[PDB]
Design a protein around this ligand. Sequence first.
Ligand SMILES: Cc1[nH]ncc1CNc1ccn(C)n1
Length: 330
Amino acid sequence: STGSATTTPIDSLDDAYITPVQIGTPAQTLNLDFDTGSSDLWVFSSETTASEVDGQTIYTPSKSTTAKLLSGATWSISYGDGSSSSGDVYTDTVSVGGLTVTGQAVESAKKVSSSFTEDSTIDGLLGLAFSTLNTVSPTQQKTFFDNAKASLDSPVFTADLGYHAPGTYNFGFIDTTAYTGSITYTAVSTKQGFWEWTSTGYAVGSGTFKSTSIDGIADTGTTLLYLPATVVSAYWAQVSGAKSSSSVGGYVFPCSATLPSFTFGVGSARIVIPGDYIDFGPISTGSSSCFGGIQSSAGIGINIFGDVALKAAFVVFNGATTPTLGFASK
Ligand SMILES: Cc1[nH]ncc1CNc1ccn(C)n1
């Protein structure tokens, strides 16, 4: 089997991407944030505290003939941005882009943090990191990909995120029309439950490539590119008037600037992030200070190849017995 779904930026800054997902019988279609940095499929639901729902589409398990309470199971998750959600668990039929999993754990939110309530565009998350990070207790649950894997034509999914445009998540096949040149594969560590890999270095603009190992995660559910402070300082030093602002919470730059590109290494290959991808616009409406899309990871404890980096590539998440990542230009 295969599946293919379009993913759409939630706003003009590509802050995140939503992908329609069919849950239950008859289908209830919710727009989920596909997150390769987490391993829970959770949704706004009929159980979510009413004051914490503001425009999201909810899953109502009582209206699904295939929903079953997973008796005793709870979940609770805290994300790197300080957001959180928790609740109970159903199993149900879940389809993505024509690919169907029966018995998928659908984590029904009883509580969500303010950032989730405030984002009317995201009805929940679909985790695509390794199932070892799933938070369901006392019986840990599998991701949608892990449940689908054995049925897929090839045990892979691909992320093809757009810059200010829709893109695609494919399951079970590699669309050889969706990228240019060849796919370069690189090793993955699953020891922290992430798609963790080592970039071979970077360049700023037309500058020379610096060969240096940068361990980080491929994370579709993180907007920005978080890299070591040395690398980030080297990037923003090429932008007149850029500075790190403790009050704003990262590097800002004059909105009048033209940003340089940023290149990262994948083995001997190179992915180029155009400068425009690094512009996250005014820090507040009407400001001439713009927020940078490359930020320090120093306060995180891990480097994160988030959407800013991933949207510059066609990315293969290879879930074979020994997982690997693939990157191609596009
Ligand atoms: C959607 C999400 N993934 N991880 C945490 C969150 C909630 N907070 C944010 C911060 C920017 N946005 C769009 N949503």
